[model samples]
Target chain A: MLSGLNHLTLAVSQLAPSVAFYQQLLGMTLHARWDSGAYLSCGDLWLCLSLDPQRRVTPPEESDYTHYAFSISEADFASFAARLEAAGVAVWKLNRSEGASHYFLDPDGHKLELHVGSLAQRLAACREQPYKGMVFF
Target chain B: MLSGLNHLTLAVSQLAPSVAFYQQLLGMTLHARWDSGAYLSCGDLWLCLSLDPQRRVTPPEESDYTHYAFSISEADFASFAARLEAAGVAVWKLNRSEGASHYFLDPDGHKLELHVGSLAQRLAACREQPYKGMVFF
Candidate 1:
């Protein structure tokens, strides 16, 4: 009976840097905080930045294709990428079927995305790229 | 520049088992699947199950407190827990100052929560508790 997501928690090695990245760079408002973690909100969604050195176990060489994608208005897309770059976060453009999308790593190497579409839109776009083998939709 | 979350991706060791847990147990609809990952929808939100052995290297002994909490109608909360138990998943009751919430671990050690209230309700309920440390807002 799961209705929808209430929040997504990400494990980070350093809480301060992670918090600053989300708040200062992404403009998420801090909603709650504990010794080990903090909750930040972006519009109606809550993102938890959890701190635990033991959970910082992902290797640096892992594939970068996997990432959490977020929604951004087309009007703000240009300025958004500029903001990310101004903050010194490297962004990588990925070839998608639907619209333009890019990938970036958080302070702890967690991959994230800023896309302009929803699941349906993304699926339709990827379907057009037969060579991408995205027929799994 | 982001409005809200479009999706959240989790790193799992195996695609098959994780897909089974989410689709069969949690009842998420598979929107897309490929060699490396699958996208499942929970309402408007998308949950990505990424299969990358290197990314799934989080230690099994890591704490389960950090998790993605999902919203469930109060009408279905009890039956939902029962369903999880019937499927042989262990549930841990976390001490919440709010309505009701329980924690459970995914097959790959990723923790998740099922709660019966919205974020505002949870925050209000929590304010009544003796903890003032939640001022991340």
Candidate 2:
């Protein structure tokens, strides 16, 4: 059986910019770097950014509904969003019953989120109020 | 300030087939389901399978270097691989310094790996041996 996600590998148009975003903006630790890819430590999971020239970098439109969400504590959510925005990363807000989240795209337009609650908390909130956001079912 | 990955949302062409692959083939527990998407638990991380018609599901070519890896125990690795093969899933072996891995594609052509070791173990192995496989740097 699958015990857990060991790492998430993403295809990026370029490696340096993607690595910079996760390392400089997100504060992830760089584990290793090779010609084709670089690995970073993202809390408990590893984020592998691989360089692929054929990869498409599509920004999310209103109709798009797929994205990855990372958890941050309530205490640091504001500062984190501020830091990301101050660094020129575009941020969008989505309000849900669980909590409010700030979504953004990486250099390759990979949709990502910095959420303010745990999985249990969000699940409970969704059960009680339900997520009424444009994205996510 | 990020704690870790709360969940990964993947865009699939269809909902039913994606759900069946994760639940029945990968042995993930369905947390919730809606019209457009379903959430499944994979150890501590959540895997969200979202239906998107515009999503592209290109099968990985030999030169492509992007995929996700799921960790499984050494004890269960063999049985899991056998089960996946018996279920008619395509399986390929990659011999790396860290350890051997079984790679396969989901119903939507999303590449996934069932690796038999912890992140720490693999990282150490990579340090000692370095991955010289077809994919991954």
Candidate 3:
């Protein structure tokens, strides 16, 4: 059986700038790099940015909501204001779920979120007020 | 500071089939289900299957290497033969890096990988025989 998420490899059109975003802005530790690829980590998350010539050069489809998220403490959430301003980041999605969240796009237009809550908290919220056809097992 | 990967929300075309693939075939625990979204867990990994009405209804590009991977022990690797056969899964990418890997497609054609190794072991292998312009930090 599958244990847990091992890693996420993203296709990117540019490698160096993507590395700079993950390492400098996102604070992911640089692990390895090559001509067309790079490896970095944020806590236990191993992120691989692989350059792909055939990748979609433009931003992802406007209707696409698929995204990766990172955990952040509520207390530390305010610190991101200055960091986001430094990069002139663009907010992609508004917060709808529980907890404080900021949805933004990376240089490659990959959607990312910083969520200030945990699964347990979310489940509790769901239990308190179930959504349409909500069920737990 | 960003702590770790909180979750991954995938824009799926169909809700029920994606849920069945994750819950029944992948052995993830179902936490909640609603009309357009469902939450499931595989160990510490939180997976969100969200139905997107405007999502592209085709498989990703062939050259795209972006994917999510799950950790599996090498001993249990072959056990997936019957499980994968039952679903008639399609193999997406071939294994080239260290350790055994099987990349396949889900109901929504999202690329998923089962990897039989850890980052530590992979780094060691990379150190033993560095790829072109490989570096570490």
Candidate 4:
């Protein structure tokens, strides 16, 4: 049985720069780095970035929806958004969900979201006003 | 500051079957289900499988490196692999890392790995015989 998520691996074109971006821009702690890859962490999320010949470096297109969403404090959301904007991160999508959400790309063009919401909140919202044909189990 | 991963949203076609695969095959608890998608969890890992018109349902090519990995117990790894095989899941890649690893495709053809290894173990291994140019922080 799957116990939990071990890590999410993203292919990167450059090693040290991606490590630096996670440490400096995303406030993650750099754990270790090797010739081809490195590891970093933000809270319990273990992100593995490794060099790739075909790694994505440009911003994702409008319809790219697969992404990793991270939790951030509502109070810190504005400041975090400002920080990302100050750094000129590319926005891949606009917020279209229950709470404050920002879809942006990392230095390696991986899609990520800083979301100010949780599963419990979304469940409660759906219960209060269910989306059409929504069902709870 | 970024806290932790709130959830991982994967675009899935045919919402109910994807929900069933997570609950039945992966031994995850179904937290909620709706018309569009459902939420499931194993430990602190929250997974959101939503319906998408462009959801991938084909095996990844030879060099697809982006993937999500889940931690499985060493004791459970063999049986889980057998279970996945009994259910006829397609394998996307072969294992090349420490501990037991199985790279397989979900019903939606997304790349996922069941790894019986931890970051601590990997760090320790790298320390014992450092990969070329490896650095620690």
Best by lDDT: 3
Each prediction's whole-model lDDT (CA): 0.73, 0.75, 0.83, 0.82
Assess the local accuracy of residue B11 in candidate 3 as a C-alpha lDDT between 0 and 100: 92
Writing each residue's lDDT as its tens digit, candidate 3 over A12-119 gives 888988888899988889988977788888898888888888666546565388899999888888788558867897777778866799888888788998888778
Clashes of each: 3, 0, 0, 0
Task: Note the DockQ of each predicted structure.
Answer: 0.52, 0.45, 0.81, 0.72
For each model, chain A TM-score?
A: 0.81, 0.85, 0.93, 0.89
lDDT of 2 by residue, A9-102 (tens): 7888887788889988899888777766777887897887777876776655732556779988888988998988898887544654347588
Residue pairs with clashing backbones, model 1? A31-B137, A97-A125, A98-A125
Residues A18-114, candidate 1: write the lDDT tens digits: 8999998888888777667787889878787877775553444544345678889888888887778777896544333336665676877667788
What TM-score number comes out for model 3? 0.95
Q: Stretches of candidate 4 above 4 Å error?
A: A57-59
**Candidate 4 lDDT over residue span A9-127, tens digit each:** 98888877788778988899888888998888889888898788776565476344678899999899989989998998888863246466888887777778888877878788778
Ranking according to TM-score, highest score first: 3, 4, 2, 1
Structural similarity of chain A in candidate 1, as TM-score: 0.81
Q: Which ten residues in a row have the lowest lDDT in candidate 4 chain A?
A: A56-65
Model 1: how far is A107 from its true place, Å?
Answer: 2.4
Q: Rank the candidates by DockQ, best first.
A: 3, 4, 1, 2
Per-residue alpha-carbon lDDT of candidate 3 for residues B1-137, written as tens digits (9 for 90 to 100): 88889999999988998899888888899989999899999899989989997666565555467789999887888788457967798767532464678778887778888988777778888898887888887
Best by TM-score: 3
How big is the positional error of residue A56 in model 4, measured in Å on the Cα after superposition?
3.4
lDDT of 4 by residue, B52-110 (tens): 77655755773358889999889988999999999998888887755788998888778
Error of 3 at B27 (Å): 0.7
The complex in candidate 1 yields a DockQ of 0.52
